[PDB]
Amino acid sequence: TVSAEDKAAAERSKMIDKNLREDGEKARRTLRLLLLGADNSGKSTIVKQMRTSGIFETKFQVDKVNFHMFDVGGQRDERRKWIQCFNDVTAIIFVVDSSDYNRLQEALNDFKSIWNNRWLRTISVILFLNKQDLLAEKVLAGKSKIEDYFPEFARYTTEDPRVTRAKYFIRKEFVDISTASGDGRHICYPHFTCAVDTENARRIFNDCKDIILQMNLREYNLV
Amino acid sequence: LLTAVVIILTIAGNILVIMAVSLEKKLQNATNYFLMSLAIADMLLGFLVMPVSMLTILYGYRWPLPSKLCAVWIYLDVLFSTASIMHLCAISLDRYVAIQNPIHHSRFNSRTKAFLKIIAVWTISVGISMPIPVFGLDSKVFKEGSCLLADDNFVLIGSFVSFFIPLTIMVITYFLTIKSLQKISNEQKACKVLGIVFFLFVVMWCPFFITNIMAVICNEDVIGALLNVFVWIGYLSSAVNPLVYTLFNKTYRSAFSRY
Amino acid sequence: EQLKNQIRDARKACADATLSQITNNIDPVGRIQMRTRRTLRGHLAKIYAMHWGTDSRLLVSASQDGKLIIWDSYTTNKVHAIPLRSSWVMTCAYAPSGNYVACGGLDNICSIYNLKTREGNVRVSRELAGHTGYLSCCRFLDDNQIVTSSGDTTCALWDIETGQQTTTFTGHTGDVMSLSLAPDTRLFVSGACDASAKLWDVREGMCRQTFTGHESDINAICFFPNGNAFATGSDDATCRLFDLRADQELMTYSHDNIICGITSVSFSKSGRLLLAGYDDFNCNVWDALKADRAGVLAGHDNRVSCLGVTDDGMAVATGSWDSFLKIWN
Amino acid sequence: VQLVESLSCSASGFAFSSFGMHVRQAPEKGLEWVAYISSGSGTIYYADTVKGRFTISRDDPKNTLFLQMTSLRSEDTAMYYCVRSIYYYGSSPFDFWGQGTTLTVDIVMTQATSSVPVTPGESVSISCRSSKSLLHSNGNTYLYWFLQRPGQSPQLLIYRMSNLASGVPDRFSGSGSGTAFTLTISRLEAEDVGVYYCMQHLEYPLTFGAGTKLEL
Amino acid sequence: QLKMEANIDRIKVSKAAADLMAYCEAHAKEDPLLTPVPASENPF
Ligand SMILES: CN(C)CCc1c[nH]c2ccccc12
């Protein structure tokens, strides 16, 4: 009760299924990254080797492993709705302003926003503090003290040791928001980088294998 | 005697694992489909072979069943044992390539790998046990009123490829996997689980294979009385592979607490 | 805002009684049992949007994978696979005549596809630009006319041949998630994160009415079959029915069991049944008059993005993040 | 979208791999079927008469429908043009035909009158019955029509007796009852003249008729 | 816009309710979902 037309349609339909399977398998080889920085971030600056108003893409390959980075110029400040699409990403890189202190409270609030979103729980975060050399120059000058901006930072215990202590203090400040959920499916990875680093792609690459390693351990019931 | 509890718990654990796989959509990945195939290979052990050994034991090692099922029952025993050994051997190798380089394992992570792995281990399990219908089948399978293997060249040379090679692969693979994981607490929990699984596999199946290998290479009543308990200890692994390969996962613990 | 407060008293003066009192004396809908008669597969990622064709034999489904596929419902056969420049999509629309399909995404462009061409491929006749942000809904008034909704707080009507906005609807203060076209096509409604649904006249280019009864953003909106009322879907886990002529909320659909947001809404041809899709992975059918949940259609393991009732009225098609779309009759 | 031939049949102006491809016109009589190939070599079918002595081949870079010949006989000699289709809900099959070549070495469909006199501006009907009931379990009727102007390869006009192919003047139309069918033409003009052939596609072979002719 | 919304002819919600019932009642029998369509008639 099936005609030659219905079977010939089934031919090109099953070829469509096969072509969709092949396209998907080609896509799964790639690993997807979403780069959010509020401002003063250096989002272009992080990876320079390789480099459409709504979404802007930079793509790099390291060790024959292809990474897709997505940055949005078009969208407004508030990011509630478009974030829901990017729940399949491998990681979300939050680049933050190391230099200035007044930004840092709002930056930590933004970190809490990306971390605590209901749809983005499973994803982890890879964190770079850009312009840390510029931060070190200013703190070595010592005119402005970030310990003034926070009373807890006023009394803190851990390049000069003082600048290193302040740098580790702001790093722990960013980690403090992330540890609170405690689920363990998602862990933030702090990293430090000056404006011009030869490869942050290495750090992105080792973080990605760490995340995939942990998900595979979870999948195989090892943990 | 004590084997009835083994039969009952072998039924119960494998049935609960199958039921927890079937009505959960969170456990539908390929890694867990291989474990579902293991529970398939392990349910049939406790209902097709172990009651036969039960009424063989209760009859004082004189088999009340007809003589036509001796080679078939031995073939079923060797098929289920080699399937439930090769399953763990492939699980350890997959675990190694998923512990060493997670990127290249997740690149090819699909249901195709599970289908190829299940087909390979089941082809191995059938092809190891296939000479027992066609070469043993009654002098090679029946002896003194009991159904025991007596073709010593198959008992020794079959145990080389069906156990001492996949054991050599578990030894080299556990070494490399624990060296790679030793190179943080999540990793150490997986190290403890891997150590428990390896140090239970080489404790629960190995005594039977060194006993029968030594009995072929060489006190007959002593070796027979050792075999009559070490086979049941080998059957006790089927009471464990449903339990210890799932119960360290939170979803399976919740599913078992539901029932 | 003094006139608004006077307007607030004015609406209260206009309505004598709530809908719920009048609804009480009618025969009950009873237990309805709808089991999925088909499930459609081949989408390898999350499905954001589906639209039913006028024939009711064809639908189009958009997904995260970046392949927009047109398939035939009854046989389950697959008619087309459209490659997309943008992987990111939130909208798909099926033209009333059926020659045209529109695709909108985070790229801030609505891509309109002519299915029929020499060489028998799907080609984009026009890519429509002029929106500062993502397009959240698209609907065809006609073969040459399309109205778009977007996160700019603007809705735009395009002439596809000319290729630029002939009118701009810019009364909203927030991102406009959803848009519904009336049966007569001359008026349409749109809902937004401002938590206000507004009645838009297509010809004038102005907002005739604004209705707010929602605590949270409205993700979905559907016109009543008569065309005098409509229902909205929100993250408030509430579906409210407003009437155009009365200019007041007639009734609200809420339950203690469900706290999750609505993601879709649609009406049966009677309008007795407002089908709704929830973030709880379950779809509930409500007696529209009494606001009593007749039954639950639960075949989806992940959230239902989109729900549509056929124009003939036979079936309900639910597309979800579970990556296969199930027809229900 | 042009099909050229040299059998080799080179296709330029479309995506080659997306189409199916398939006809023999006798010098004495009308169209009769040769062979069918799907898109990317899905399936092949033959009628018994020309079966086993011909081959079909596709190559994506060369973009060509191929005929290699065996058992050459006076039946083989013919004028053939490459015929194609696309199948989905909303099918418009047998849309476009090749230029043609000349070489020199089951359901029966026919309409009663081989030659029809024509008067301008007057409606007339051409009826060809079908052996197997065109109506199918879905409700899609597989009845088709063509027109071959002399010196030009034919074109599609009407499919299924309720749907009319685009690219056709709307005057031509159809009416149908179960397994008994009557076509409706109106306002016949110049360039309407030719030989009209009708077809049945419930199951292969493609049962093509000798057809009827419009005579001025 | 507020003048346009203010300049709206307004009608009793009860009358609008009865009108809402009327269309439902007229097309209550027609729609397959409320009353189960017979099996042979349904396309699915
Ligand atoms: C008794 N059962 C545990 C034997 C299983 C087995 C696996 N491979 C064999 C080779 C020879 C004899 C027995 C076995």
Short mmCIF file of N, CA, C and O in Angstrom, two decimals, chain C residues 177-277:
data_model
loop_
_atom_site.label_atom_id
_atom_site.label_comp_id
_atom_site.label_asym_id
_atom_site.label_seq_id
_atom_site.Cartn_x
_atom_site.Cartn_y
_atom_site.Cartn_z
N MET C 177 8.64 39.10 23.14
CA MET C 177 8.95 37.68 22.97
C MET C 177 8.08 37.02 21.91
O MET C 177 8.56 36.17 21.16
N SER C 178 6.79 37.38 21.86
CA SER C 178 5.79 36.62 21.10
C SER C 178 4.85 37.56 20.36
O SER C 178 4.65 38.70 20.76
N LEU C 179 4.28 37.04 19.27
CA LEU C 179 3.36 37.77 18.41
C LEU C 179 2.32 36.81 17.86
O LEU C 179 2.67 35.69 17.45
N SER C 180 1.05 37.22 17.87
CA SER C 180 -0.05 36.43 17.33
C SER C 180 -0.86 37.27 16.35
O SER C 180 -1.14 38.44 16.62
N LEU C 181 -1.26 36.65 15.25
CA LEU C 181 -2.01 37.30 14.18
C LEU C 181 -3.48 36.92 14.29
O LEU C 181 -3.82 35.75 14.52
N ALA C 182 -4.36 37.91 14.13
CA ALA C 182 -5.78 37.67 14.28
C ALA C 182 -6.33 36.91 13.07
O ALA C 182 -5.68 36.84 12.02
N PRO C 183 -7.52 36.31 13.20
CA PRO C 183 -8.15 35.68 12.02
C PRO C 183 -8.40 36.65 10.88
O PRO C 183 -8.25 36.27 9.71
N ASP C 184 -8.77 37.90 11.18
CA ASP C 184 -9.06 38.87 10.12
C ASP C 184 -7.79 39.48 9.53
O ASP C 184 -7.87 40.14 8.49
N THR C 185 -6.63 39.31 10.19
CA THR C 185 -5.28 39.73 9.77
C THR C 185 -5.07 41.25 9.91
O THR C 185 -3.91 41.70 9.94
N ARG C 186 -6.12 42.04 10.13
CA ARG C 186 -5.98 43.49 10.20
C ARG C 186 -5.47 43.98 11.55
O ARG C 186 -4.96 45.11 11.62
N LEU C 187 -5.60 43.19 12.62
CA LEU C 187 -5.08 43.53 13.94
C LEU C 187 -4.26 42.35 14.45
O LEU C 187 -4.55 41.20 14.12
N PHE C 188 -3.23 42.66 15.24
CA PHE C 188 -2.38 41.64 15.85
C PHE C 188 -1.94 42.11 17.23
O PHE C 188 -2.01 43.30 17.55
N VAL C 189 -1.49 41.16 18.04
CA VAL C 189 -1.05 41.40 19.41
C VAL C 189 0.40 40.95 19.55
O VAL C 189 0.89 40.14 18.75
N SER C 190 1.06 41.49 20.58
CA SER C 190 2.48 41.15 20.85
C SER C 190 2.72 41.26 22.37
O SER C 190 2.13 42.16 22.99
N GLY C 191 3.56 40.38 22.93
CA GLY C 191 3.86 40.36 24.35
C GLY C 191 5.35 40.46 24.58
O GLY C 191 6.16 40.10 23.72
N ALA C 192 5.72 40.95 25.76
CA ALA C 192 7.09 41.36 26.03
C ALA C 192 7.48 41.13 27.48
O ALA C 192 6.65 40.83 28.34
N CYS C 193 8.79 41.30 27.74
CA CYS C 193 9.35 41.26 29.08
C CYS C 193 8.90 42.42 29.95
O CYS C 193 9.10 42.37 31.17
N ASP C 194 8.19 43.40 29.37
CA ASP C 194 7.62 44.52 30.18
C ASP C 194 6.38 44.00 30.92
O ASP C 194 5.86 44.73 31.79
N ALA C 195 5.93 42.78 30.60
CA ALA C 195 4.75 42.15 31.19
C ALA C 195 3.46 42.87 30.81
O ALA C 195 2.53 42.95 31.61
N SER C 196 3.42 43.40 29.59
CA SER C 196 2.23 44.02 29.01
C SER C 196 2.03 43.47 27.61
O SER C 196 2.98 43.37 26.83
N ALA C 197 0.78 43.12 27.30
CA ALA C 197 0.38 42.69 25.97
C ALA C 197 -0.44 43.81 25.34
O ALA C 197 -1.37 44.33 25.98
N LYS C 198 -0.10 44.18 24.11
CA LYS C 198 -0.69 45.33 23.43
C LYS C 198 -1.33 44.90 22.12
O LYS C 198 -0.82 44.03 21.42
N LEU C 199 -2.44 45.55 21.81
CA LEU C 199 -3.20 45.31 20.59
C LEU C 199 -2.76 46.30 19.53
O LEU C 199 -2.87 47.51 19.72
N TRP C 200 -2.27 45.77 18.41
CA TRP C 200 -1.67 46.56 17.34
C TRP C 200 -2.54 46.47 16.10
O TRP C 200 -2.89 45.37 15.67
N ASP C 201 -2.88 47.62 15.52
CA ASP C 201 -3.57 47.67 14.24
C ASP C 201 -2.52 47.66 13.14
O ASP C 201 -1.60 48.49 13.15
N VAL C 202 -2.65 46.71 12.21
CA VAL C 202 -1.65 46.56 11.16
C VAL C 202 -1.62 47.79 10.26
O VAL C 202 -0.55 48.31 9.92
N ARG C 203 -2.79 48.28 9.86
CA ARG C 203 -2.84 49.34 8.86
C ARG C 203 -2.39 50.67 9.44
O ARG C 203 -1.62 51.40 8.79
N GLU C 204 -2.85 51.02 10.64
CA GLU C 204 -2.54 52.33 11.20
C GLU C 204 -1.05 52.47 11.52
O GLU C 204 -0.45 53.51 11.23
N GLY C 205 -0.45 51.44 12.11
CA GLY C 205 0.87 51.55 12.68
C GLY C 205 0.89 52.05 14.11
O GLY C 205 1.90 52.63 14.53
N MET C 206 -0.19 51.83 14.86
CA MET C 206 -0.35 52.34 16.22
C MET C 206 -0.88 51.23 17.11
O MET C 206 -1.46 50.24 16.64
N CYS C 207 -0.68 51.40 18.42
CA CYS C 207 -1.22 50.50 19.44
C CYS C 207 -2.61 50.99 19.83
O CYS C 207 -2.76 52.11 20.31
N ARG C 208 -3.61 50.14 19.62
CA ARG C 208 -4.98 50.53 19.96
C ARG C 208 -5.25 50.34 21.45
O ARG C 208 -5.90 51.19 22.07
N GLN C 209 -4.77 49.24 22.03
CA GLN C 209 -5.01 48.92 23.43
C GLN C 209 -3.77 48.27 24.04
O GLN C 209 -2.96 47.67 23.34
N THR C 210 -3.64 48.41 25.36
CA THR C 210 -2.61 47.75 26.15
C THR C 210 -3.26 47.06 27.33
O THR C 210 -4.08 47.66 28.03
N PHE C 211 -2.87 45.79 27.53
CA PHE C 211 -3.45 44.96 28.63
C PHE C 211 -2.32 44.37 29.47
O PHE C 211 -1.41 43.74 28.90
N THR C 212 -2.38 44.55 30.79
CA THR C 212 -1.41 43.98 31.73
C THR C 212 -2.15 43.29 32.86
O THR C 212 -2.98 43.90 33.54
N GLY C 213 -1.87 42.00 33.05
CA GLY C 213 -2.32 41.26 34.21
C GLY C 213 -1.30 40.25 34.71
O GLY C 213 -1.62 39.39 35.53
N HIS C 214 -0.06 40.37 34.23
CA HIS C 214 0.96 39.34 34.37
C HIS C 214 2.06 39.82 35.30
O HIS C 214 2.50 40.97 35.22
N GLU C 215 2.51 38.93 36.19
CA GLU C 215 3.61 39.27 37.09
C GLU C 215 4.95 39.27 36.37
O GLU C 215 5.83 40.08 36.68
N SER C 216 5.11 38.38 35.38
CA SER C 216 6.40 38.12 34.74
C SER C 216 6.28 38.30 33.24
O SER C 216 5.23 38.65 32.70
N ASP C 217 7.40 38.06 32.56
CA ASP C 217 7.46 38.16 31.11
C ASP C 217 6.51 37.17 30.45
O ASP C 217 6.26 36.09 30.99
N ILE C 218 5.97 37.56 29.30
CA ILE C 218 5.06 36.73 28.52
C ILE C 218 5.89 36.07 27.42
O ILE C 218 6.42 36.75 26.54
N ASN C 219 6.02 34.74 27.48
CA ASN C 219 6.80 34.02 26.48
C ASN C 219 5.98 33.68 25.24
O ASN C 219 6.54 33.52 24.15
N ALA C 220 4.66 33.53 25.38
CA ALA C 220 3.80 33.04 24.31
C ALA C 220 2.45 33.75 24.34
O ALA C 220 2.01 34.21 25.39
N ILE C 221 1.81 33.83 23.17
CA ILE C 221 0.54 34.52 22.99
C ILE C 221 -0.22 33.83 21.87
O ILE C 221 0.39 33.43 20.87
N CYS C 222 -1.54 33.68 22.03
CA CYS C 222 -2.39 33.09 21.00
C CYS C 222 -3.76 33.75 20.99
O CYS C 222 -4.39 33.91 22.04
N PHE C 223 -4.23 34.06 19.77
CA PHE C 223 -5.57 34.68 19.61
C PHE C 223 -6.65 33.62 19.72
O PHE C 223 -6.41 32.46 19.31
N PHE C 224 -7.81 34.00 20.25
CA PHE C 224 -8.95 33.10 20.36
C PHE C 224 -9.48 32.83 18.95
O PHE C 224 -9.28 33.65 18.05
N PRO C 225 -10.12 31.67 18.70
CA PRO C 225 -10.59 31.40 17.33
C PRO C 225 -11.59 32.41 16.78
O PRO C 225 -11.57 32.70 15.58
N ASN C 226 -12.46 32.95 17.64
CA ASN C 226 -13.35 34.03 17.22
C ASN C 226 -12.56 35.25 16.75
O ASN C 226 -12.96 35.93 15.80
N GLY C 227 -11.45 35.54 17.42
CA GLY C 227 -10.66 36.73 17.17
C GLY C 227 -10.94 37.90 18.09
O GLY C 227 -10.34 38.97 17.89
N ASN C 228 -11.82 37.74 19.08
CA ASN C 228 -12.15 38.79 20.03
C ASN C 228 -11.41 38.67 21.36
O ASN C 228 -11.53 39.56 22.20
N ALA C 229 -10.64 37.60 21.57
CA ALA C 229 -9.93 37.36 22.82
C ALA C 229 -8.60 36.70 22.52
O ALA C 229 -8.35 36.27 21.39
N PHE C 230 -7.73 36.63 23.53
CA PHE C 230 -6.46 35.95 23.37
C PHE C 230 -5.93 35.53 24.73
O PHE C 230 -6.36 36.04 25.77
N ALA C 231 -5.01 34.57 24.71
CA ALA C 231 -4.37 34.02 25.90
C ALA C 231 -2.87 34.17 25.79
O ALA C 231 -2.32 34.17 24.68
N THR C 232 -2.20 34.31 26.94
CA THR C 232 -0.77 34.57 27.02
C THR C 232 -0.10 33.54 27.91
O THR C 232 -0.73 33.00 28.82
N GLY C 233 1.17 33.28 27.63
CA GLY C 233 1.98 32.34 28.39
C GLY C 233 3.20 33.05 28.97
O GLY C 233 3.91 33.76 28.25
N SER C 234 3.43 32.83 30.27
CA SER C 234 4.40 33.60 31.04
C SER C 234 5.24 32.69 31.92
O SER C 234 4.93 31.51 32.11
N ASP C 235 6.32 33.26 32.45
CA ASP C 235 7.14 32.58 33.45
C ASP C 235 6.48 32.56 34.83
O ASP C 235 6.95 31.82 35.70
N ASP C 236 5.35 33.23 34.97
CA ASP C 236 4.58 33.28 36.24
C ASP C 236 3.87 31.96 36.50
O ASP C 236 3.22 31.85 37.54
N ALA C 237 3.96 30.98 35.61
CA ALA C 237 3.20 29.72 35.70
C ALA C 237 1.71 30.06 35.70
O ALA C 237 0.97 29.37 36.43
N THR C 238 1.28 31.07 34.93
CA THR C 238 -0.13 31.48 34.79
C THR C 238 -0.44 31.79 33.34
O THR C 238 0.42 32.32 32.66
N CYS C 239 -1.63 31.43 32.89
CA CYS C 239 -2.11 31.76 31.55
C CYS C 239 -3.40 32.55 31.69
O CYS C 239 -4.37 32.06 32.29
N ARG C 240 -3.32 33.80 31.23
CA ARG C 240 -4.47 34.72 31.43
C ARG C 240 -5.17 35.02 30.11
O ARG C 240 -4.48 35.24 29.09
N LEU C 241 -6.50 35.05 30.15
CA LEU C 241 -7.35 35.32 29.01
C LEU C 241 -7.88 36.75 29.10
O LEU C 241 -8.55 37.10 30.08
N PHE C 242 -7.58 37.55 28.08
CA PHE C 242 -8.06 38.92 27.95
C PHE C 242 -8.97 39.00 26.74
O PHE C 242 -8.83 38.23 25.79
N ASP C 243 -9.92 39.94 26.78
CA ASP C 243 -10.91 40.13 25.73
C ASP C 243 -10.69 41.50 25.11
O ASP C 243 -10.47 42.48 25.84
N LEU C 244 -10.74 41.57 23.78
CA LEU C 244 -10.50 42.84 23.10
C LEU C 244 -11.62 43.84 23.35
O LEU C 244 -11.36 44.99 23.70
N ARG C 245 -12.88 43.42 23.16
CA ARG C 245 -13.99 44.36 23.27
C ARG C 245 -14.14 44.86 24.70
O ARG C 245 -14.37 46.05 24.93
N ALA C 246 -14.01 43.96 25.69
CA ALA C 246 -14.17 44.31 27.12
C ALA C 246 -12.93 45.07 27.61
O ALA C 246 -13.11 45.96 28.47
N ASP C 247 -11.75 44.75 27.10
CA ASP C 247 -10.47 45.39 27.53
C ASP C 247 -10.25 45.07 29.01
O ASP C 247 -10.03 46.02 29.78
N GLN C 248 -10.31 43.79 29.39
CA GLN C 248 -10.13 43.34 30.79
C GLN C 248 -9.76 41.85 30.80
O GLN C 248 -10.15 41.16 29.84
N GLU C 249 -9.06 41.37 31.84
CA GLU C 249 -8.72 39.95 31.95
C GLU C 249 -9.99 39.19 32.31
O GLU C 249 -10.63 39.48 33.33
N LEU C 250 -10.37 38.24 31.46
CA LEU C 250 -11.55 37.42 31.74
C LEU C 250 -11.25 36.37 32.81
O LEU C 250 -12.01 36.22 33.77
N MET C 251 -10.15 35.63 32.65
CA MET C 251 -9.83 34.55 33.59
C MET C 251 -8.34 34.24 33.52
O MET C 251 -7.66 34.58 32.55
N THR C 252 -7.86 33.58 34.57
CA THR C 252 -6.47 33.16 34.71
C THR C 252 -6.42 31.67 35.01
O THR C 252 -7.22 31.17 35.80
N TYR C 253 -5.47 30.98 34.38
CA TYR C 253 -5.28 29.54 34.53
C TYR C 253 -4.02 29.27 35.35
O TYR C 253 -2.91 29.47 34.86
N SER C 254 -4.21 28.81 36.59
CA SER C 254 -3.10 28.55 37.51
C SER C 254 -3.45 27.37 38.40
O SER C 254 -4.62 27.08 38.65
N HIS C 255 -2.41 26.68 38.88
CA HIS C 255 -2.55 25.51 39.74
C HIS C 255 -1.38 25.43 40.70
O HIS C 255 -0.29 25.92 40.41
N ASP C 256 -1.61 24.79 41.85
CA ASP C 256 -0.56 24.66 42.86
C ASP C 256 0.52 23.68 42.41
O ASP C 256 1.69 23.84 42.75
N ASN C 257 0.13 22.65 41.65
CA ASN C 257 1.07 21.60 41.27
C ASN C 257 2.21 22.13 40.40
O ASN C 257 3.31 21.58 40.41
N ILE C 258 1.95 23.19 39.64
CA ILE C 258 2.86 23.68 38.60
C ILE C 258 3.30 25.09 38.98
O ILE C 258 2.49 26.02 39.00
N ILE C 259 4.60 25.23 39.27
CA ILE C 259 5.25 26.53 39.45
C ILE C 259 6.08 26.95 38.24
O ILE C 259 6.60 28.07 38.22
N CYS C 260 6.21 26.08 37.24
CA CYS C 260 7.14 26.33 36.14
C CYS C 260 6.51 27.24 35.09
O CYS C 260 5.29 27.33 34.96
N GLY C 261 7.38 27.92 34.34
CA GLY C 261 6.90 28.90 33.38
C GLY C 261 6.23 28.25 32.18
O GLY C 261 6.58 27.14 31.77
N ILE C 262 5.25 28.96 31.61
CA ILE C 262 4.68 28.54 30.34
C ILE C 262 5.65 28.91 29.23
O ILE C 262 6.28 29.97 29.27
N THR C 263 5.72 28.07 28.20
CA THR C 263 6.61 28.35 27.05
C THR C 263 5.80 28.45 25.77
O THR C 263 6.36 28.96 24.77
N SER C 264 4.54 28.01 25.78
CA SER C 264 3.74 28.00 24.57
C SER C 264 2.27 27.97 24.96
O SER C 264 1.92 27.56 26.07
N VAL C 265 1.41 28.40 24.03
CA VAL C 265 -0.03 28.33 24.20
C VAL C 265 -0.68 28.17 22.84
O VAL C 265 -0.17 28.65 21.82
N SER C 266 -1.82 27.48 22.82
CA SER C 266 -2.65 27.41 21.62
C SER C 266 -4.07 27.01 22.01
O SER C 266 -4.31 26.47 23.09
N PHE C 267 -5.00 27.27 21.10
CA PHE C 267 -6.42 27.04 21.29
C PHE C 267 -6.90 25.94 20.36
O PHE C 267 -6.45 25.86 19.21
N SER C 268 -7.81 25.10 20.85
CA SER C 268 -8.60 24.27 19.96
C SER C 268 -9.60 25.15 19.20
O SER C 268 -9.85 26.30 19.57
N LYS C 269 -10.16 24.60 18.12
CA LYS C 269 -11.05 25.39 17.27
C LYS C 269 -12.28 25.85 18.03
O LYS C 269 -12.83 26.93 17.75
N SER C 270 -12.76 25.04 18.97
CA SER C 270 -13.82 25.49 19.85
C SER C 270 -13.38 26.70 20.66
O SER C 270 -14.15 27.65 20.85
N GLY C 271 -12.13 26.70 21.11
CA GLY C 271 -11.68 27.59 22.16
C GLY C 271 -11.97 27.08 23.55
O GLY C 271 -11.55 27.72 24.53
N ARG C 272 -12.67 25.95 23.68
CA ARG C 272 -12.88 25.34 24.99
C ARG C 272 -11.56 24.90 25.61
O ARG C 272 -11.40 24.96 26.83
N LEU C 273 -10.62 24.46 24.79
CA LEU C 273 -9.37 23.86 25.25
C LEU C 273 -8.21 24.78 24.89
O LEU C 273 -7.92 24.98 23.70
N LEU C 274 -7.56 25.35 25.91
CA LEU C 274 -6.33 26.11 25.74
C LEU C 274 -5.18 25.17 26.09
O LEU C 274 -4.90 24.93 27.27
N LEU C 275 -4.51 24.65 25.07
CA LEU C 275 -3.34 23.82 25.30
C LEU C 275 -2.17 24.71 25.70
O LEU C 275 -1.98 25.79 25.13
N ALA C 276 -1.40 24.27 26.69
CA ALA C 276 -0.26 25.03 27.19
C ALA C 276 0.92 24.10 27.41
O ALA C 276 0.75 22.95 27.83
N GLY C 277 2.11 24.61 27.13
CA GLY C 277 3.36 23.89 27.31
C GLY C 277 4.21 24.54 28.38
O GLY C 277 4.40 25.76 28.37
#
